[PDB]
Structure 1
């Protein structure tokens, strides 16, 4: 059965980028997924998106630009301390220069670079570059 919708979303967009498609239909939508995609947009990795409100769990249609290389999820959501964050961006991210690890903190779903600023660490979610 469908465990962890975010993962599904990320795979779906990812495949649709390797294929070089223009738009992706991802379902179901979640608030976590929407926040993730917003974050991704904020760094110019995706473009804008529409949340089709079906009265169930909604669907999202995301505009794609060839700017994204790999959009991955890490499950389980490991607890990442601010001490141990350096080890993750050494393992997951392809360079020190670019790429982002998305993690959920009490302060909100954000990047690792913003986490560092706000001093808060949290549970890891995904990563994109």
Structure 2
């Protein structure tokens, strides 16, 4: 069955972009999917998206450009300690310079750059570049 819903949305995306696709319909969506789709959006990795309202759990249409090499999800959502964030981005990001680790902290779902600036930390959601 389903343990997580994010992992499906992310994968669906990745296969869309790999095909050469410019849109996807993910299902079923969640506040966390929105928040993650949103961080991606702010940065450029996707275009605009749209939450369609079935009387159920939702369905999202993402319009994607093609700046996206990969958006992954980290499971389980490990706790990170401010100097485990430095260790994570190195593990899974292309160059020190770019790509984001996106985690969930007490003060919001955020990319790790925003994390560093706020100076808060938490549990790791996923990534992209």
TM category (shorter chain) comes to: over 0.9
Q: Could you tell me the TM-score, scaled by structure 1's length?
A: 0.98
Q: Shift in Å at residue 92 of structure 1?
A: 0.6
Q: Shift in Å at residue 22 of structure 1?
A: 1.1
Residue 52 of structure 1 corresponds to: 52
Q: Secondary structure at the match of 2:72?
A: strand
Residue 112 of structure 2 corresponds to: 112
Cα distance in 1 for residues equivalent to 2:113 and 2:22: 29
Q: Could you tell me the TM-score, scaled by structure 2's length?
A: 0.98
Q: Shift in Å at residue 20 of structure 1?
A: 1.0
The one-character-per-residue Cα deviations of 1:72-109 (angstroms, maximum 9, x if unpaired) are 00000000110211110110101111100010001100
Residue 69 of structure 1 corresponds to: 69
Q: Shift in Å at residue 119 of structure 1?
A: 0.6
Q: Shift in Å at residue 21 of structure 1?
A: 0.3
Residue 14 of structure 2 corresponds to: 14
Q: Secondary structure at the match of 2:47?
A: coil
Cα distance in 1 for residues equivalent to 2:81 and 2:13: 29
Cα distance in 1 for residues equivalent to 2:17 and 2:44: 15
Unaligned runs of 5+ in 1: none
Unaligned runs of 5+ in 2: none
Q: Secondary structure at the match of 2:12?
A: helix
Cα distance in 1 for residues equivalent to 2:111 and 2:38: 11
Deviating 4+ runs (over 6 angstroms): none
